[PDB]
């Protein structure tokens, strides 16, 4: 009720990374959560004023 319903703000509480959305699946005596996170890969340096 805070990852599947709704778009949370809680990292390490809705998977690993900035939580996007959540797909639940049934399981024998279990619940399985998929997670979608926005975790970018490639960067640089940059220079400010």
């Amino acid at each position: 009720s805070e990852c599947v319903l709704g778009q949370s703000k809680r990292v390490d509480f809705c998977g690993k990374g900035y939580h996007l959305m959540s797909f639940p699946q049934s399981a024998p005596h279990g619940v399985v959560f998929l997670h979608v996170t926005y975790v970018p890969a490639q960067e640089k340096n940059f220079t400010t004023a």
């Binding site: 809680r10 990292v11 390490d12 509480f13």
Partner: protein, 49 residues
């Protein structure tokens, strides 16, 4: 078992052996709700982790 005889020791052994593992019964309950006090404080660590 040695001094008391198994006819009239059996009501003594009635709640000697049946009662002794009732004392880590104490201990694990003392354990886990310090452990689950931290297993959720894991999640409370995970709040600002």
């Amino acid at each position: 078992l040695s001094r008391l005889d198994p006819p009239e020791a059996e009501v003594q052994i009635d709640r000697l052996i049946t009662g002794r593992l009732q004392s880590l019964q104490t201990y694990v309950t003392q354990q886990l709700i310090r452990a689950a006090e931290i297993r959720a404080s894991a999640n409370l660590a995970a709040t600002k982790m």
